[PDB]
Amino acid sequence: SNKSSLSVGSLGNTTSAARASSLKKIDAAIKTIDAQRADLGAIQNRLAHNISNS
C-alpha cells in the first residue's frame, strides 16, 4: 500500500475531467485500505481465540 499501488501518485485538478477522475480514484483507494484493515482485524480476533484455547 503506497501511492503507486493505490493509483493516487499522479492526480490533477486543472480541468473538470481531471477533478472527476481524481475524486473517483481517491474514493477507490479509501475502499481498498478498508478491505485490508478488515482482514487484519479478523486475523487478530482468530489469534486471540487460539491463544485462549492453548
Q: How far is the CB of 16 from another protein (least distance, A)?
A: 28
Examine residue 44 and tell whether it contacts another protein (CB under 8 A). no
Show Cβ contacts of residue 26 under 8 Å, excluding neighbours closer than 6 positions: 8, 11
Helices (H) then strands (E): counts for the chain: 1, 0
Q: How far is the CB of 40 from another protein (least distance, A)?
A: 15
Examine residue 53 and tell whether it contacts another protein (CB under 8 A). yes
Which of 10, 14, 44, 49 lies at the binding interface for another protein (CB under 8 A)?
A: 49
Q: How many CA atoms lie within 13 A of 25 on its CB side?
A: 17
